Amino acid sequence: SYNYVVTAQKPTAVNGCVTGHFTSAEDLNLLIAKNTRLEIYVVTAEGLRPVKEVGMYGKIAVMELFRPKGESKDLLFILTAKYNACILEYKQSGESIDIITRAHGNVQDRIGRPSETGIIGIIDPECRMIGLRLYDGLFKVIPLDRDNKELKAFNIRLEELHVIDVKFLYGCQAPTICFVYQDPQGRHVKTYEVSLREKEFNKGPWKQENVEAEASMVIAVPEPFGGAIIIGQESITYHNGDKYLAIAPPIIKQSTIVCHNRVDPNGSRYLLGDMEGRLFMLLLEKEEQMDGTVTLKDLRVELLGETSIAECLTYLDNGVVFVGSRLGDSQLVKLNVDSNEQGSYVVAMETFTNLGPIVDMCVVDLERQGQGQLVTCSGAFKEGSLRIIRNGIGIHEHASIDLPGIKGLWPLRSDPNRETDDTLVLSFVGQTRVLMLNGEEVEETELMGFVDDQQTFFCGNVAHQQLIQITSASVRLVSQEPKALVSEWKEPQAKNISVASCNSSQVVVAVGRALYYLQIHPQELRQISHTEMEHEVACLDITPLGDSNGLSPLCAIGLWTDISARILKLPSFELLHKEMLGGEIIPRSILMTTFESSHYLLCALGDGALFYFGLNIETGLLSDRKKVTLGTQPTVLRTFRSLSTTNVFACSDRPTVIYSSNHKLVFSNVNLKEVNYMCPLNSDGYPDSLALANNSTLTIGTIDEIQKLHIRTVPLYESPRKICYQEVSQCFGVLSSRIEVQGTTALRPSASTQALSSSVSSEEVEVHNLLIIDQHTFEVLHAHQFLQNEYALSLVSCKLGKDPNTYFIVGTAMVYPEEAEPKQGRIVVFQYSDGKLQTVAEKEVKGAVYSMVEFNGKLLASINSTVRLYEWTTEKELRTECNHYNNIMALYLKTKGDFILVGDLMRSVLLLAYKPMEGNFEEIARDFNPNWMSAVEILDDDNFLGAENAFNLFVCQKDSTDEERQHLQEVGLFHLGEFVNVFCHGSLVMQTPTQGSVLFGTVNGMIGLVTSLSESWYNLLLDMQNRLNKVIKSVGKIEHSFWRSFHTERKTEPATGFIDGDLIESFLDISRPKMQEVVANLQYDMKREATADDLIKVVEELTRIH
């Protein structure tokens, strides 16, 4: 098996968050862990400024900042889920930012079952040690000597086997842990000192205490309080020596508090977040003492308001809180001293997309044909949603004029008072036209000073309240009031101008090979200098960059013949830098531009190639050449603003926006047909807009947010579970569940209680529903509620037998507390007609209906340990045809032709065939290796894909004996690092090295793709990986091969049959010399030594598949 796996959407769920001074001594930073990704921000009064985002070869399990004695700057400790430990430092060497690994090592033990309650990692306030709870009964200590670069550790026996939480205390002479543990006698809090000298615990400073039965979190309180707060379900207690204070506030009893964060450095106030998204303030009241110590007088809890359900909370000063969510969108909120109308102190400032968990999804061509969109069931509880995801950036067209032959567009302010454009100047072969803008009206008009009988190459507002028009014949300077020609420049023999560039006070024009530099003065075009280039000029730019006061010391130029992009000094025209771009196709557009504070040269060729380089605006040096391909026609580049950010629109057959993300250039398709020319337009009637032209038409519209994927959110206010599309009804079916309390009563309104119409089947509880949702408005048209204690598990939309209706079919389970698994459930066939669901037929079965699939006009269903095929009879009932029994728990089905792939709870996958001339199933083959499955997919007749609970993928094949024949072989293995809930065939790209397309959705909201490769392609890419791994410096010095090794509690093996597309794609981001190392000696097709250029082309083809 040869497979390739790549990220289409990175994990969005927030697994943890910390604050401190990491980037510099005086920066306040927010660090966010999104599984495999670490995001670093500087906190401002403006908000969060992104400075650096890195990938780890690992799932981040522990992330803590700490400050070694007498240092100005925090270091970062990370532990991965595979027990990779590192200490990281942030270093900025001028422009370049580097994460350096100061220490690393793997801290796994040989014997050890991972603690069921997870990895805990803590660091003592005096930075003497890191403490890790990895396994029950052991506490691992890493001394923080500067010498301990390998992070060598020792284990201490911990008598208490079941630790709930642990922290290091402040204000202690020896490092001291405080922890809650559980035994038969209940829950207790205890302390121990940790002796480095003895490598053992010593007696803690205070005696143990019994605590609440559901005590779950330990907070170490800084000086001057010291001590610990213990949070439980109905109590909050403070402990410190012969000091004990407890409160039992009813207000917290409704929902478990699951996260905390310190507001005040001295511990006077904490935030607390619960499972329903309530946000509390915990206040510690001080009492003075004669000896000048400070003790705790009392504790209070106050309800502040509501946030997203928080996985973590981080106070960012000035009343600002970052709410990191796993189950909904993350937020920035503000806390105010005074409450609002409805009584909340919490006001939301910003919302960040989280797709996670993705519990189901499907692919549908909603709008066009051939343009797939992903529709997910996302989130949980009050955060549950549908998310609709599609590639590319949209334009909202607001005007359309038929007007062929446009050769350029320029906006103009004809009134020197008003700030908005009021004029659009259009060029045509040998002619110019001026459109005036009065509101939404676009009237043809003249404009005194400008000529209409020459083609315009540039026109604009310029210095000293003047306008400029540059044509093939001359440069014309025009006064604003009144409009009159005040100056006109011509070449000495009045030869044609061939190329024009202009800013507010400078002009460079070309005449064949000649260049002329003019300055714009009051009533004067002043000729400053001229030169003769070695070849004919193709293109020019003099865009001023940086702190430049609108003046460029640089001229960028592209030439014929040598195909060079050059940087020249003005006024002398001295050559500062030359780059030969190769080939025999001339540069067509060149642009100096700034993205996220870094300066670049862009240069586009007529064949669709785009080169880009770092530009030093001081020396004129170009560096770090990169090349993408943006189409096959000449590309024309032009800056525009939207949402207070400068970007570049690339006009071609493939219109593109160029922008920056994490200080790397990014290229995103615009969803339009061919655009030939554009300009920004910001007029009264068309504010913050774009004017667009093709061969026949002028358009004016606004642009969506600049990003790779557009996401629409449909709030449900309850948990979505499964989704299916029903084309004939133009709706989705969505299974959903809401929580109600002890009959039962609801916590808030939600999709299933707010449908247009409703039907019903004739502690906290789940109430399950089938929602019918309109595909255009996403309005809830109908909700059908299932029986009390009925859980809806599976859903399909299909036709059966000879019946022409399409039905929604739901499989359920009746859930009773004492049952190990369900012994009762239903299959229900519904028809959606006239705005309601009618129940057409039912069938009681003796188990949970985990999975259903349409199979050759029949209904395949898995019921507990049985796989069953039903026929749909002429009297509209389901009738069993055949059964398969050899499963533990058949959770997952997929089919292809007569083949059925079965995913088991614990015995991996199994391949059935229906035998149409015997009316029964045959077991073809089974994977005899145990695996705890989460999802399955058929890649093709011979290849079966599985995902399992320890975040691995594998691929099974038949072994091309007869006892031998029924053994599936695991021929592919890969540690993905995500939990796959759903696989589905399809693509987000409009319909090569790869064949097939399978998308997957995950708990962290990551979306991935799996596709197939030939042996040949695999071998090349495998070889590339090995070379890439030798040159790339990895954060924490984790080996890529270690990261991607298949890993469960049973077995660890190198990955095989799987290319890591994220790694391959990173090839485009290394330095050109590194690309040479990577390239040196490797075959490529009959055969030859491959070049860096060859590989850039290949990797580009591979980015196109998502």
148 to 187: interface string for ligand A1AK9, x by CB under 6 A: x--x------------------------------------
The SS3 assignment for 47 reads coil
Q: Which stretch binds ligand A1AK9 (CB under 6 A): 143-151, 183-191, 612-620, 776-784?
A: 143-151
When asked if residue 102 is in the footprint of ligand A1AK9 (CB under 6 A), the reply is yes
Token output for 77: 């400790």
Question: Please, what is the minimum distance in Å from the beta carbon of residue 53 to ligand A1AK9?
Answer: 22
DSSP tally for the chain: helices H, then strands E: 5, 90
Contact (Cβ atoms closer than 8 angstroms) between residue 601 and residue 594 = no
Q: Which is nearer to ligand A1AK9, 71 or 302 (CB)?
A: 71
The SS3 assignment for 761 reads coil
When asked if residue 123 is in the footprint of ligand A1AK9 (CB under 6 A), the reply is no
Contact (Cβ atoms closer than 8 angstroms) between residue 681 and residue 398 = no
From CA 660, how far away is CA 657, in angstroms rounded?
Answer: 10
Among 21, 53, 67, 89, binds ligand A1AK9 (CB under 6 A): 89
Closest CA to 792 of 720, 744, 864: 720
Q: Which is nearer to ligand A1AK9, 148 or 886 (CB)?
A: 148
Q: Which is nearer to ligand A1AK9, 85 or 945 (CB)?
A: 85
When asked if residue 199 is in the footprint of ligand A1AK9 (CB under 6 A), the reply is no
Question: Please, what is the minimum distance in Å from the beta carbon of residue 662 to ligand A1AK9?
Answer: 24
Question: Please, what is the minimum distance in Å from the beta carbon of residue 135 to ligand A1AK9?
Answer: 22
Question: Please, what is the minimum distance in Å from the beta carbon of residue 155 to ligand A1AK9?
Answer: 17
Contact (Cβ atoms closer than 8 angstroms) between residue 761 and residue 787 = yes
Contact (Cβ atoms closer than 8 angstroms) between residue 635 and residue 610 = yes
The SS3 assignment for 57 reads coil
Among 32, 40, 87, 189, binds ligand A1AK9 (CB under 6 A): 87
Question: Please, what is the minimum distance in Å from the beta carbon of residue 87 to ligand A1AK9?
Answer: 5
- Interstrand relation of 780-785 and 757-760 (parallel, antiparallel or unpaired): parallel
Of residues 829-848, those binding ligand A1AK9 (CB under 6 A)? none
Question: Please, what is the minimum distance in Å from the beta carbon of residue 91 to ligand A1AK9?
Answer: 8
Please state the three-class secondary structure of 147-176 as a single string.
CCCCCCCEEEECCCCCEEEEEECCCCCCCE
Token output for 116: 């069921």
Q: Which is nearer to ligand A1AK9, 1034 or 1045 (CB)?
A: 1034
Amino acid at 390: R
Among 31, 144, 389, 813, binds ligand A1AK9 (CB under 6 A): 144
Contact (Cβ atoms closer than 8 angstroms) between residue 15 and residue 327 = no
When asked if residue 69 is in the footprint of ligand A1AK9 (CB under 6 A), the reply is no
From CA 1004, how far away is CA 982, in angstroms rounded?
Answer: 13
Question: Please, what is the minimum distance in Å from the beta carbon of residue 100 to ligand A1AK9?
Answer: 8
When asked if residue 68 is in the footprint of ligand A1AK9 (CB under 6 A), the reply is yes
φ, ψ (nearest 5 deg) of residue 1026: -60, -35
Question: Please, what is the minimum distance in Å from the beta carbon of residue 142 to ligand A1AK9?
Answer: 7
φ, ψ (nearest 5 deg) of residue 298: -160, 170
Q: Which stretch binds ligand A1AK9 (CB under 6 A): 17-25, 141-149, 485-493, 705-713?
A: 141-149
Question: Please, what is the minimum distance in Å from the beta carbon of residue 172 to ligand A1AK9?
Answer: 20
From CA 390, how far away is CA 711, in angstroms rounded?
Answer: 7
Q: Which is nearer to ligand A1AK9, 148 or 966 (CB)?
A: 148
Q: Which residue has the tokens 């990261």?
A: 1043
Q: Which residue has the tokens 């922290």?
A: 167
When asked if residue 103 is in the footprint of ligand A1AK9 (CB under 6 A), the reply is yes
Q: Which stretch binds ligand A1AK9 (CB under 6 A): 145-153, 196-204, 643-651, 917-925?
A: 145-153
Specify the DSSP element, H or E, that contains 1021: helix 1015-1031
Quick one: angle between helices 1072-1079 and 1092-1103, nearest 10? Answer: 100
Contact (Cβ atoms closer than 8 angstroms) between residue 900 and residue 912 = yes
Token output for 810: 């739901």
Q: Which stretch binds ligand A1AK9 (CB under 6 A): 19-27, 140-148, 577-585, 620-628?
A: 140-148
When asked if residue 550 is in the footprint of ligand A1AK9 (CB under 6 A), the reply is no
Question: Please, what is the minimum distance in Å from the beta carbon of residue 663 to ligand A1AK9?
Answer: 23
Amino acid at 442: V
Question: Please, what is the minimum distance in Å from the beta carbon of residue 744 to ligand A1AK9?
Answer: 55
Question: Please, what is the minimum distance in Å from the beta carbon of residue 152 to ligand A1AK9?
Answer: 9
Q: Which is nearer to ligand A1AK9, 148 or 759 (CB)?
A: 148
Closest CA to 771 of 781, 760, 761: 781
Token output for 680: 């920004």
Among 110, 146, 673, 1087, binds ligand A1AK9 (CB under 6 A): 146
Q: Which stretch binds ligand A1AK9 (CB under 6 A): 146-154, 186-194, 468-476, 644-652?
A: 146-154
Question: Please, what is the minimum distance in Å from the beta carbon of residue 64 to ligand A1AK9?
Answer: 13
From CA 1046, how far away is CA 5, in angstroms rounded?
Answer: 14
Surface-to-core class of residue 892, CB atoms within 10 Å of its CB (0-12 exposed, 13-18 middle, 19+ buried): buried
Token output for 99: 């994460």
Number of chain positions touching ligand A1AK9 (CB under 6 A)? 10
When asked if residue 71 is in the footprint of ligand A1AK9 (CB under 6 A), the reply is yes
When asked if residue 132 is in the footprint of ligand A1AK9 (CB under 6 A), the reply is no
Q: Which stretch binds ligand A1AK9 (CB under 6 A): 144-152, 751-759, 836-844, 997-1005?
A: 144-152
Q: Which is nearer to ligand A1AK9, 124 or 160 (CB)?
A: 124
- Interstrand relation of 506-511 and 514-521 (parallel, antiparallel or unpaired): antiparallel
Contact (Cβ atoms closer than 8 angstroms) between residue 251 and residue 229 = no
Chain contacts with ligand A1AK9 (rule: CB under 6 A): 68, 71, 87, 89, 102-103, 144, 146, 148, 151
